[PDB]
Design a protein around this nucleic acid. Structure first.
Lengths: 98, 91
DNA sequence: AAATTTGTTTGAATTTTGAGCAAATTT
DNA sequence: AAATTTGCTCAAAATTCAAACAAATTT
């Protein structure tokens, strides 16, 4: 009855394929492409903060959307994210979301 | 200005970058719409896993398997990196 | 007026980190 | 044969957590 939906297919993104046809592709892939392209642009100095660099690109929209979803309610937001309300507050502070 | 971007195409077949974060926003918007008021639980772990995997998958690839250079590039402890690779069974 | 959330502290649990070392691998 | 990296400890620095609670706010 229920068809399997794999973890990679929970968060997806509309793409266009070789037959100009609209289709969903994992968010995983977006991150792949973003980095593939990042690396090309390194001609060719050193990086020492690639994790933080990425993590910020991703924490921001996530907090944004979840706060929109909970209409500003931090308690529910932290709950639905699976983190302490304290860490959420501090994250939001980090990104000036307050 | 933005270092992490992805390629889009419009109806005029023009390719054009957009920040990764925009993709992330889209994904979540779509996610939330799909679930009609079912409750979400470990959404942070969810997104993190979906992002940490393709990141490790690519730094390793770029450092040709070298954990040490990988960990330095990312800005995290080699120990931490090992832990993450085991967490996603990529080792 | 009740119920819930916020803003904040406190201290314990967990995670990350740096450093050190023989063994293995790469150069 | 030298240099680097790995796999593994140890403990200590940092971050995350839960549990308060009054004051504020939302219902």
């Amino acid at each position: 009855m229920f068809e399997q939906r794999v973890n990679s297919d929970v968060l997806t993104v509309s793409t266009v394929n070789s037959q100009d046809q609209v289709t969903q592709k994992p968010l995983r892939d977006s991150v792949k492409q973003a980095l593939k392209n990042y690396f090309a642009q390194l001609n060719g100095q050193d990086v020492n903060d690639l994790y933080e660099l990425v993590l910020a690109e991703v924490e921001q929209p996530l907090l944004d959307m979840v706060m929109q979803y909970t209409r500003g309610n931090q308690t529910r937001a932290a709950l639905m994210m699976g983190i302490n309300r304290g860490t959420l507050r501090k994250k939001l502070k980090k990104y000036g979301m307050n």
